[PDB]
Scaffold this active site. Structure first.
Site, PDB file in Angstrom:
ATOM      1  N   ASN A   1       1.731   7.806  14.238  1.00 35.53           N
ATOM      2  CA  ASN A   1       2.062   9.055  13.529  1.00 35.53           C
ATOM      3  C   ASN A   1       2.009  10.281  14.440  1.00 35.53           C
ATOM      4  OD1 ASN A   1       2.622   7.816  11.078  1.00 35.53           O
ATOM      5  ND2 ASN A   1       0.669   8.351  10.123  1.00 35.53           N
TER       6      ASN A   1
ATOM      7  N   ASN B   1       8.732   9.200   7.659  1.00 35.73           N
ATOM      8  CA  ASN B   1       9.269   8.053   6.933  1.00 35.73           C
ATOM      9  C   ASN B   1      10.756   7.908   7.209  1.00 35.73           C
ATOM     10  OD1 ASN B   1       6.712   7.497   5.936  1.00 35.73           O
ATOM     11  ND2 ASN B   1       7.089   8.469   3.950  1.00 35.73           N
TER      12      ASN B   1
ATOM     13  N   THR C   1      -5.780  -1.886   1.353  1.00 36.63           N
ATOM     14  CA  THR C   1      -4.708  -2.771   0.854  1.00 36.63           C
ATOM     15  C   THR C   1      -3.796  -3.138   2.003  1.00 36.63           C
ATOM     16  OG1 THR C   1      -2.942  -3.233  -0.756  1.00 36.63           O
ATOM     17  CG2 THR C   1      -3.255  -0.947  -0.191  1.00 36.63           C
TER      18      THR C   1
ATOM     19  N   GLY D   1       0.813  -1.225   0.000  1.00 38.79           N
ATOM     20  CA  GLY D   1       0.000   0.000   0.000  1.00 38.79           C
ATOM     21  C   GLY D   1       0.839   1.265   0.000  1.00 38.79           C
TER      22      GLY D   1
ATOM     23  N   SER E   1       0.056  -0.306   6.505  1.00 35.37           N
ATOM     24  CA  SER E   1      -0.777   0.334   7.514  1.00 35.37           C
ATOM     25  C   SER E   1      -1.816  -0.653   7.969  1.00 35.37           C
ATOM     26  CB  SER E   1      -1.500   1.556   6.947  1.00 35.37           C
ATOM     27  OG  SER E   1      -0.608   2.634   6.757  1.00 35.37           O
TER      28      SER E   1
ATOM     29  N   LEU F   1      17.364 -11.689  13.074  1.00 33.60           N
ATOM     30  CA  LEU F   1      15.900 -11.622  12.964  1.00 33.60           C
ATOM     31  C   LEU F   1      15.173 -12.797  13.624  1.00 33.60           C
ATOM     32  CD1 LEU F   1      15.561 -10.443   9.257  1.00 33.60           C
ATOM     33  CD2 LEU F   1      15.367  -9.001  11.287  1.00 33.60           C
TER      34      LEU F   1
ATOM     35  N   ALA G   1      -8.127  -0.440  -3.091  1.00 36.19           N
ATOM     36  CA  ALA G   1      -9.032  -1.095  -2.145  1.00 36.19           C
ATOM     37  C   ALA G   1     -10.000  -0.127  -1.445  1.00 36.19           C
ATOM     38  CB  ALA G   1      -8.241  -1.870  -1.100  1.00 36.19           C
TER      39      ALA G   1
ATOM     40  N   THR H   1      -7.224   9.604   9.975  1.00 36.32           N
ATOM     41  CA  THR H   1      -7.597  10.097   8.654  1.00 36.32           C
ATOM     42  C   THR H   1      -8.883   9.443   8.174  1.00 36.32           C
ATOM     43  OG1 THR H   1      -6.153   8.452   7.618  1.00 36.32           O
ATOM     44  CG2 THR H   1      -5.233  10.648   8.014  1.00 36.32           C
TER      45      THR H   1
ATOM     46  N   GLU I   1      16.030 -14.115  16.380  1.00 31.30           N
ATOM     47  CA  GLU I   1      16.116 -13.885  17.830  1.00 31.30           C
ATOM     48  C   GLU I   1      14.857 -13.267  18.428  1.00 31.30           C
ATOM     49  OE1 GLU I   1      18.581 -14.558  19.995  1.00 31.30           O
ATOM     50  OE2 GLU I   1      20.502 -14.568  18.933  1.00 31.30           O
TER      51      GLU I   1
HETATM   52  N1  LIG Z   1       3.996   6.982   8.551  1.00 31.84           N
HETATM   53  C1  LIG Z   1       3.287   7.162   7.411  1.00 31.84           C
HETATM   54  N2  LIG Z   1       1.966   6.846   7.424  1.00 31.84           N
HETATM   55  C2  LIG Z   1       1.209   6.994   6.310  1.00 31.84           C
HETATM   56  C3  LIG Z   1       1.838   7.499   5.085  1.00 31.84           C
HETATM   57  N3  LIG Z   1       0.871   7.543   4.158  1.00 31.84           N
HETATM   58  C4  LIG Z   1      -0.281   7.109   4.734  1.00 31.84           C
HETATM   59  N4  LIG Z   1      -0.076   6.815   6.028  1.00 31.84           N
HETATM   60  C5  LIG Z   1      -1.050   6.265   6.988  1.00 31.84           C
HETATM   61  O1  LIG Z   1      -1.667   5.118   6.404  1.00 31.84           O
HETATM   62  C6  LIG Z   1      -3.066   5.101   6.720  1.00 31.84           C
HETATM   63  C7  LIG Z   1      -3.860   5.268   5.438  1.00 31.84           C
HETATM   64  O2  LIG Z   1      -3.556   4.138   4.628  1.00 31.84           O
HETATM   65  P1  LIG Z   1      -2.855   4.156   3.178  1.00 31.84           P
HETATM   66  O3  LIG Z   1      -1.563   3.371   3.189  1.00 31.84           O
HETATM   67  O4  LIG Z   1      -2.787   5.544   2.581  1.00 31.84           O
HETATM   68  O5  LIG Z   1      -4.020   3.377   2.409  1.00 31.84           O
HETATM   69  P2  LIG Z   1      -3.713   2.161   1.424  1.00 31.84           P
HETATM   70  O6  LIG Z   1      -2.855   1.143   2.134  1.00 31.84           O
HETATM   71  O7  LIG Z   1      -3.125   2.677   0.130  1.00 31.84           O
HETATM   72  O8  LIG Z   1      -5.158   1.483   1.281  1.00 31.84           O
HETATM   73  P3  LIG Z   1      -6.242   1.904   0.184  1.00 31.84           P
HETATM   74  O9  LIG Z   1      -5.817   3.190  -0.467  1.00 31.84           O
HETATM   75  O10 LIG Z   1      -7.511   1.965   0.977  1.00 31.84           O
HETATM   76  O11 LIG Z   1      -6.211   0.750  -0.780  1.00 31.84           O
HETATM   77  C8  LIG Z   1      -3.304   6.266   7.662  1.00 31.84           C
HETATM   78  O12 LIG Z   1      -3.193   5.806   9.015  1.00 31.84           O
HETATM   79  C9  LIG Z   1      -2.192   7.220   7.275  1.00 31.84           C
HETATM   80  O13 LIG Z   1      -1.848   8.117   8.332  1.00 31.84           O
HETATM   81  C10 LIG Z   1       3.281   7.806   5.153  1.00 31.84           C
HETATM   82  O14 LIG Z   1       3.888   8.234   4.159  1.00 31.84           O
HETATM   83  N5  LIG Z   1       3.923   7.613   6.309  1.00 31.84           N
HETATM   84 MG   LIG Z   2      -3.540   3.619  -1.537  1.00 31.54          MG
END
Ligand SMILES: Nc1nc2c(ncn2[C@@H]2O[C@H](COP(=O)(O)OP(=O)(O)OP(=O)(O)O)[C@@H](O)[C@H]2O)c(=O)[nH]1
Ligand SMILES: [Mg+2]
Ligand SMILES: Nc1nc2c(ncn2[C@@H]2O[C@H](COP(=O)(O)OP(=O)(O)OP(=O)(O)O)[C@@H](O)[C@H]2O)c(=O)[nH]1
Ligand SMILES: Nc1nc2c(ncn2[C@@H]2O[C@H](COP(=O)(O)OP(=O)(O)O)[C@@H](O)[C@H]2O)c(=O)[nH]1
Ligand SMILES: Nc1nc2c(ncn2[C@@H]2O[C@H](COP(=O)(O)OP(=O)(O)O)[C@@H](O)[C@H]2O)c(=O)[nH]1
Ligand SMILES: [Mg+2]
Lengths: 428, 426, 426, 428
Positions: free
Chosen positions: A197, A219, A136, A10, A131, A243, A90, A170, A245
């Site tokens: 976050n 990141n 996804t 994702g 996430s 890993l 997704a 979010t 461990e």
């Molecule tokens: N640490 C961090 N968190 C992120 C970032 N981008 C999105 N998030 C977190 O990821 C979650 C949102 O999920 P995403 O990864 O954007 O969604 P996805 O996995 O692409 O899933 P769908 O788009 O629904 O298919 C939230 O909790 C966001 O705060 C990032 O660059 N860094």
């Molecule tokens: Mg996405």
């Protein structure tokens, strides 16, 4: 000799991977084209002459985020077949990720993983970045986890997870997704390292003096932790930890597999000059709640296992002393069934810093992986959130549309109730 | 005439082992290529005790290096003296044990053990008359502990009449370096009580203390700690390798110091140990050495010998010395500290003297104490283990590898029994 | 053959002590590195009385340095002769005592005392036959007074048959250097009367007077004052370190000079003392020395010996001298000043002569008077203490450290008793 | 080896600290950037390479005064985290300082203090600089004092206090604040060294020939006294006195803990040339009332304990002689229950002088700390002032607004009455 496969799932996963890989390249002197003018081999395969390729797979159900990778600075770094994209996302729906959309691409990704594994002589395992909240990151990841267990089984699987915050969040359906992925992944994951976050934002603001932290910064911060975790494999140290461990040292019961990460010291060039960053001082920093990477109250919980991974100019004796001091401190409490609570790694390489990064260059760092009954609190709030929304069946129809059944939700609820009970009971 | 076969298991085992080998090489005048560049004929006379002659006036350690991970091996091979080792004597797995005794003993270790056994057999069959085996390892990890233990048992089956020696780095009292340490230690101990002839209990905590307080070392390294261990080991085999006035080898020491078969856990000590500054402000005489030896601050086990009684003490001296002085001083100490020596073994002290001192020094000593205070260590581990078992904590990591609960119980029972026995004699 | 163990406690103790050590080194021809560069074989024959031989023809003081603060220690180590001391013999705390006897004796000192005792024990056990102990300190501070006193008692418990000597700088009559001085002094005295064999009462006021009037010193330094004390100390042990015609060591002197156990507080004196100008205008003969000795202006205690009577006087002479002359002169003085000598001890004077004079001089003398006039000093302190106690002033600083009022009362009682006893004999 | 922590509270405290730290830097050859091209370590920690940082904490409830520090010449000297500021001041209100505003920042400051203490091997104690009259200097300081006692307790605490003058005073509510802070701090402070702005002005005018002394001048003068007090710790002397000493030698009963400071000689280059500044002469200067730093009549009181700290080219004998002479003088009277009234320190280092300062360079100086029943008079006037205003309940409402109760005022009054009674009774 011994190798590690990284999976980035994702948007969040992919972006984290971008950071991590960049950091790795910087550390091993690999250029964005794969060239370098031999432990790095644990993360990079070698092809023909003067080219090195990450042992990584990038997956997303929409093309947009990965399309940036394939057009960006590190386009030549990754082999095209290991950057896998579908057409439709997704849409923050676990069901789309796990069933409707995910079942179309999962086989392909498995094949690639198998191919990667074919080139491994001593596969240590997999690191999956994703996430909990995205369709996804949740649905696809659970699907992938289950599949991995069947194909492989005995090999260790580790998760890095952006855990949702209490206040800041979010998505609207995020609780549903979090519960469901937890339910489905529980029996398939050996250890999952949560971060938050909100916590990273606060640390950036407070400790790094950054008014407006961006996702990139977060990141980058994450990347450091990852480096710390894998430095024991990518370099040679005094006393080092692989890993395989972690799972044995941090997981006392199979379901209680959620240790949390803390990094120290995270400070700018302003406050780095005006400080003697000694081993004791950094270690102490990690056990104070304001520096930790998940928003939660350890003071209200008890520690069950703690793993400290030191890097750079560090000597065993001082570390030992620090640990003793921590033990002595009454405000840092360990459960009574664990007299030995520390697992300690020490590696010679100081943290390498990305040009144009927020962090100053330091002689020493530490990454703590800690397992605490305080996670129960976090679980509870999430559960409560789930409960409210389900009471009205809010959004439930969407999930049903994608083939999910209402009973699944009930099951998920039940499993989370069980988990929280288990957490409580370990405490007493 | 007599031969010693060296085994190194796991990270700790390998790292101590390398240092030891280096020390030995220095002593016998052998360089990192295997060639003798010494001067004294005494250095070469009994070189066959530790080295095979591989032609072209080159010598190779009778040393077997074992680990479930290759990283350690790589580190060793690339180190100073890495080139002296026989390449075929490095026996490594690919998986690792993840600080799990079960993996070391029953799973990963099981797969690899045959090869190591074969190598050992080969080594034995080339050597004319093996005195026995020395194994360096930790009890707190998975490889050194589980696989090392397995190796011991297998060795004993083949060679039941040969001496089985271990230098085991044990879990410290203050700070633990693994979470499952008590389990790994306990299981190791269970096998060790039944299958070794003697075990030298080395504690990292004690070493650290020594480095800080006696050696005045601001920033001790693990290497430095290992050095002390190596020195002790060297001291222990000196009578096999050089001439002397009174000589005691591994068997002599064992018979002197072990009155009942199970009570073979020693607290080793080494003397003298001085700073760079405090080198000037003391004379190199036997009394000083004696003082250093009989002192809690100089013991390499984290146990206070004044909290128990000495069953036996073996003292091994190196250098040109008056035997009379030694005899008097050993007597005198005993007279002074009568309450710390068991009353039903008159003359608790065994003395040996080797004419060749270690390099850079005029005189040195190695101490082996069999003290009933060692029970404390056992007790501390035992309690911890019991506590852990009360909640069945981490148990699935071991049972998942095929181990049964019953084994754990058995181990506990043995541990408790040992401590009871120690108490009885006290 | 015989050995003396030196202890220095607190700031005053350390500072006098260093000077003393320097003096001794000069006398025995030992330089700041520990090496002997002397000429006369007499300088080395009895060097073992104060120095241990630490090999490489190097000598180290049998000296233990104690303080609750490290600053003093640092100052000493950095000083001229700081390098001769054994590094492990510096035993320092981190806190300090803040001129509080309670802290020195019961709190901070208590924590540190064990280590010092151990060191002392070690020192004793290396030396073949300890004559005893000499402690330098003040009674007015917290460390030297409270911790020093504690040390004395502990030493006595271990070594009840050995001689216990103190060189104590006591509170002056005119000016006080601390507000709680009377308390600290009093408590110290309480322990001293019961636990030392003799105490040399040094007074800074007296030293100042000597510097001004006799030495003609415009600007005396504390160092200069200390020098005199050091000289006196040296004079007192001369018969242990060199040959003579008539020899008296610490025990001989003590038995001659202490007729009842409690009356062991001496007024020491040193002769001759001349300016740079007045060096020419007097002959170096025994009579002059005698005159200097028997004179209030030359006493290092702030008490007029003509306000009491001498119980005993010990005179220790250094240099090549006619014994007849000495005998005559001691007789003559007694005859002249019959009223200042107790009538029921015929021949109040003990004489000793050592052939080796101190460096730079042809002839020297040290005087020890046991005069009933010392009572005056005790009285003055006692009155002050009583006054302070009447208002319970500063008491919470001591009671806060665990001390009880009863102790104070006891101390007072002892003090009064001592003075009564002195009066009785007078 | 043995270390001292300085706390600077409110405007007055902060400004005094600025002077003191500057002086220290000058004395040890530390540049305003923390560099110097080893006893200074008692006041300065060492970081990395060629940088030295004061063991100090600066606190104020408004940003303005500290903002000058962070923008000024010594911006690089202090570590940013040890300069602590709120947003709103205590507005000359004890209650705002102690409760409403102070309770928001106290925890933070405590944490910093704890961190400072972590780097100490032999902590001697704390020096706190503050006014009695300001809302932060009073209210915040009392809060902080109490907290310190709980956390630490046995370690010595010393106060430097700008005591309000009889005639000259800036605030209208100053008496209220002074009484209240005295009440609340009494059981928590071991020794407090008062000085008075009026007295320093007069001395500046009379002895230094300065027409118009500014607050800076006063601060500079104060700095010298502080240096004198701490020179025994920062250098090696003949006969020397630590911070643990004073409390035992100057405080005969726990509540009578207010000794006063006097410095000598304070003279310009005009009058320095035309004088032989001998030890006797300087010592004598200190016992005459016109040179003393608190406006008050010692001739009408009795001395209870006197501590003399000499610095520079000074020899014991002459000091002793001087003391004897002082004792002889009938007009300098000591209470009858204290036959030994002198505690004497002698340090080798002459007073170092700030370039562009008002003071001439001298071979010798002395700082006397004297405890006198004359302080009773000072207390009395203050009490009287309090009494008048409270008779009308003038300003009382403001205090109430910030959570204070009227009964507290009564309690404070009672405690001060007790104190004055105690003072009287010691005299007789
Ligand atoms: N640490 C961090 N968190 C992120 C970032 N981008 C999105 N998030 C977190 O990821 C979650 C949102 O999920 P995403 O990864 O954007 O969604 P996805 O996995 O692409 O899933 P769908 O788009 O629904 O298919 C939230 O909790 C966001 O705060 C990032 O660059 N860094
Ligand atoms: Mg996405
Ligand atoms: N010696 C000296 N006294 C000062 C200085 N500045 C202020 N004062 C005194 O301090 C008192 C006023 O208190 P301040 O410190 O300004 O007030 P504050 O502590 O900031 O308290 P609030 O502003 O009310 O929160 C008065 O008695 C002033 O005379 C200074 O620079 N030196
Ligand atoms: N003395 C010593 N002990 C070590 C060293 N390295 C690791 N240890 C100890 O060994 C234990 C960890 O076991 P290790 O040997 O790393 O695991 P293994 O590789 O699976 O056998 C801990 O108790 C460490 O303190 C070393 O170099 N010297
Ligand atoms: N003769 C002499 N007396 C000293 C010296 N230094 C301090 N004193 C005296 O010792 C007393 C103070 O005790 P001090 O030794 O400083 O306290 P301590 O450090 O706690 O033992 C006072 O009576 C001083 O006059 C010195 O160098 N020589
Ligand atoms: Mg203000």
């Amino acid at each position: 000799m011994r190798e590690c496969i990284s999976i980035h799932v994702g948007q969040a996963g992919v972006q984290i991977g971008n950071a991590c890989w960049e950091l790795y390249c910087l550390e091993h002197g690999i250029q964005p084209d794969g060239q370098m003018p031999d432990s790095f081999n644990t993360f990079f395969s070698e092809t023909g002459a003067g080219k090195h390729v990450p042992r990584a797979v990038f997956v997303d159900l929409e093309p947009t985020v990965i399309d940036e990778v394939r057009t960006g600075t590190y386009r030549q770094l990754f082999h095209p077949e290991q950057l896998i994209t579908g057409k439709e996302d997704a849409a923050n729906n676990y069901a789309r990720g796990h069933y409707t959309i995910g079942k179309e691409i999962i086989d392909l990704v498995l094949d690639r993983i198998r191919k990667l594994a074919d080139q491994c002589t001593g596969l240590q395992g997999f690191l999956v970045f994703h996430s909990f909240g995205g369709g996804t990151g949740s649905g696809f990841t659970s699907l992938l986890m289950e599949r991995l267990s069947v194909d492989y089984g005995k090999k260790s699987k580790l998760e890095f997870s952006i855990y949702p915050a209490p206040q800041v969040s979010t998505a609207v359906v995020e609780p549903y997704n979090s519960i469901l992925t937890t339910h489905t992944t529980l029996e398939h994951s050996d250890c999952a390292f949560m971060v938050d976050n909100e916590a990273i934002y606060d640390i950036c603001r407070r400790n790094l003096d950054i008014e407006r932290p961006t996702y990139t910064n977060l990141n980058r911060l994450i990347s450091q932790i990852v480096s710390s975790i894998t430095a024991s494999l990518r370099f040679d140290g005094a006393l080092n930890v692989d890993l395989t461990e972690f799972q044995t040292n941090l997981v006392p019961y199979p379901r209680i597999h959620f240790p949390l990460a803390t990094y120290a010291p995270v400070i700018s060039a302003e406050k780095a000059y005006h400080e003697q960053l000694s081993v004791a001082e950094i270690t102490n920093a990690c056990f104070e709640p304001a520096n930790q990477m998940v928003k939660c109250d350890p003071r209200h919980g008890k520690y069950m296992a703690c793993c400290l991974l030191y890097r750079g100019d560090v000597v065993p004796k001082d570390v030992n002393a620090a640990i003793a001091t921590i033990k002595t401190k009454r405000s840092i409490q360990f459960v009574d069934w664990c007299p030995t609570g520390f697992k300690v790694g020490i590696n010679y390489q100081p943290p390498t810093v990305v040009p144009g990064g927020d962090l100053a260059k330091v002689q020493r760092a530490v990454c703590m992986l800690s397992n605490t009954t305080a996670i129960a609190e976090a679980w509870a709030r999430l559960d409560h959130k789930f409960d409210l929304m389900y009471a009205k069946r809010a959004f439930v129809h969407w999930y049903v549309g994608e083939g999910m059944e209402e009973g699944e939700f009930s099951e998920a609820r039940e499993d989370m109730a069980a988990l929280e009970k288990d957490y409580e009971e370990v405490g007493v | 005439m007599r031969e010693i076969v060296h085994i190194q298991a796991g990270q700790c085992g390998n790292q101590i082992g390398a240092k030891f080998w280096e020390v030995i090489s220095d002593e016998h005048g052998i360089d990192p290529t295997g060639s003798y560049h010494g001067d004294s004929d005494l250095q070469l006379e009994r070189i066959n005790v530790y080295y095979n002659e591989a032609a072209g006036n080159k010598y190779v350690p009778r040393a077997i290096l074992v680990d479930l991970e290759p990283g350690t091996m790589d580190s060793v091979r690339s180190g100073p003296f890495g080139q002296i080792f026989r390449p075929d004597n490095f026996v490594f797995g690919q998986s690792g044990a993840g600080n799990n005794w079960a993996k070391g003993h029953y799973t990963e270790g099981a797969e690899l053990v045959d090869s190591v056994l074969d190598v050992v057999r080969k080594e034995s069959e080339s050597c004319d008359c093996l005195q026995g085996f020395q194994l360096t390892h930790s009890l707190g990890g998975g490889t050194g502990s589980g696989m090392g233990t397995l190796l011991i048992s297998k060795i004993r089956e083949e060679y039941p009449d040969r001496i089985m020696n271990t230098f085991s780095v044990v879990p410290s009292p203050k700070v633990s370096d693994t979470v499952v340490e008590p389990y790994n230690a306990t299981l190791s101990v269970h096998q060790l009580v039944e299958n070794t002839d003697e075990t030298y209990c080395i504690d990292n905590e004690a070493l650290y203390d020594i480095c800080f307080r006696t050696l005045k070392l601001t920033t001790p390294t693990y290497g430095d700690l290992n050095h002390l261990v190596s020195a002790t080991m060297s001291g222990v085999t000196t009578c096999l390798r050089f001439p002397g006035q009174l000589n005691a080898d591994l068997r002599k020491l064992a018979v002197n110091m072990v009155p009942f078969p199970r009570l073979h856990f020693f607290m080793p000590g080494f003397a003298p140990l001085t700073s760079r500054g405090s080198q000037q402000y003391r004379a190199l005489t036997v009394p000083e050495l004696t003082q250093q030896m009989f002192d809690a601050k100089n013991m390499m086990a984290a146990c206070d010998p004044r909290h128990g009684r000495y069953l036996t003490v073996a003292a091994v001296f190196r250098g040109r010395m008056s035997m009379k002085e030694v005899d008097e001083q050993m007597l005198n100490v005993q007279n002074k500290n009568s309450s710390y020596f068991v009353e039903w073994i008159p003359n608790n002290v065994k003395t040996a003297v080797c004419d060749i001192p270690p390099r850079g020094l005029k005189m040195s000593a190695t101490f082996i104490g069999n003290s009933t205070a060692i029970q404390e260590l056992f007790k501390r581990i035992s309690e911890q283990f019991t506590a852990m078992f009360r909640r069945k904590a981490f148990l699935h990591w071991y049972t998942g590898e095929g181990m049964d609960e019953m084994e754990f119980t058995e181990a506990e029972s043995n541990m408790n029994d040992l401590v009871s026995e120690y108490q009885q004699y006290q």
